[model samples]
Target: SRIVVHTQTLFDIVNDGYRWRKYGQKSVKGSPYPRSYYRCSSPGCPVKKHVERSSHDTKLLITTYEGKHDHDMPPG
Candidate 1:
């Protein structure tokens, strides 16, 4: 798992050097911000990740990645 703290309006945490296709988004039980779910665009890849903003601080974006990249990492 990895967490990134960015100071920008980031709808997608694609800075991990890989492309992802968002599948769904849901609001947390008590958080005003919603969590976005994404999967690797590459076929046969089981990589999955989620992006959500901190409820306490909307400025903070927390990204959690799971599994491994099935291909090479793209340039930032």
Candidate 2:
């Protein structure tokens, strides 16, 4: 249920040619940014994942994922 991705940054959200609307976000104990939750909008993918910028390195973003990306579309 976790892996790295090379996804596109759009609307400050990672996109994979599909939409994953944020259902909720949980604040981290020591971070200004809250981690986000997203579920696949399409019927083919069932999921939820945590997405947050690297606390130590804000320039980088980390998202947890593990799914069918054999058909990836300009998303990491």
Candidate 3:
């Protein structure tokens, strides 16, 4: 699953009510902004996501999520 968001403020955390561990970040070809990759903090959770700024709209954020969370949302 994937979600796209447009906001004025760029957040370090999206705050989807789950704890995440930042695994890596890389530059994308043809885009000036880099992409940030994150993994679920919960053990055994395979969910992964990446956040990147829109090339056309700098204020828009493009977040792509993969897989489903095996555990319930954490308190964080």
Candidate 4:
């Protein structure tokens, strides 16, 4: 099953003591805000997440999770 994680949860996940690195930030065309990319801190791990504010509601955030965790360490 797929989970739809909102912007606030995404922010809380990243800012709430978890280890993550911002890899890229790009302005999406036709969108008011840019998209922020983050990846798990674990070395060689391919999991990445993208966050962007909803154009309709700035308070609402859209996040997309990519890849699966293949490491022994638990994903934060």
Best by lDDT: 3
Q: What C-alpha lDDT does candidate 2 achieve relative to the native structure? A: 0.65
Clashing pairs in 4: none
Superpose all Cα atoms of candidate 2 onto the true structure and report the RMSD in Å to 1 decimal.
Answer: 4.3
Measured against the true structure, the TM-scores of the candidates, in listed sequence, are: 0.71, 0.66, 0.78, 0.64
Q: How well does model 4 score by local distance difference test?
A: 0.68
Candidate 4: regions farther than 4 A off: 1-4, 8-18, 71-76
Model 3, position 15: C-alpha lDDT score: 68
Off by over 4 Å in 3: 1-8
* TM-score attained by model 1: 0.71
lDDT string for model 3 (1-76, tens) is: 6555555546535667878888899997767868999998999998888888777766667778887899999864
Question: Ranking under TM-score, best-scoring first?
Answer: 3, 1, 2, 4
lDDT of 4 by residue, 1-76 (tens): 2234665542423342335688889997667778888887878887777778766755677777777666765555
**Which pairs clash inside model 1?**
none
- Residue-wise lDDT of candidate 2 within 12-74, one digit each (tens)? 466546667678999876567898888766556655567876666566667886565333443
Error of 4 at 3 (Å): 5.7
lDDT agreement with native, every candidate = 0.74, 0.65, 0.78, 0.68
Candidate closer to the true structure by lDDT (higher is better), 1 or 4: 1
